[PDB]
Amino acid sequence: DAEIKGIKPKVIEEYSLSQGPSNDSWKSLMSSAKDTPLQYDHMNRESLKKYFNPNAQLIEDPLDKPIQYRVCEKCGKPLALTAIVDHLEN
C-alpha cells in the first residue's frame, strides 16, 4: 500500500527500540519463573480468573497427544507420571 520511511521517532524512544548479551537470553528468565504461577499458551490468565473458578482444574490441548502413563509391574495399575514415585514407595 504505502512505502515506509521508518518508525516514528517518539515511539522509538518511548519503547527504547534502539536497545541482553545474549547467549544468556533464555536462562535469564529462571528467576521470574520461580515466583511465577503456571501459565498456559492460550488460556489468558486474566480471562481465566474472571470467567472460570479460582479452583478450576485445567489441561491445555487435552487431546494433543496420547495419555502419558506407565503401568506398574506388580499391581498392573496405570499410573500417571506424577503418581509413579509415590506408588512405588508402597
Binding site: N23, S25, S28, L29, M30, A33, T36, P37, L38
Partner: peptide
Amino acid sequence: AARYILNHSVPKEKFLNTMKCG
C-alpha cells in the same frame, strides 16, 4: 529448566526472551 520456564513465563517475557532470535 527450559520446560519449566516455558510454563512459568508471562506472554511478553516468553516472546521477547524465548521466541526472539539472537
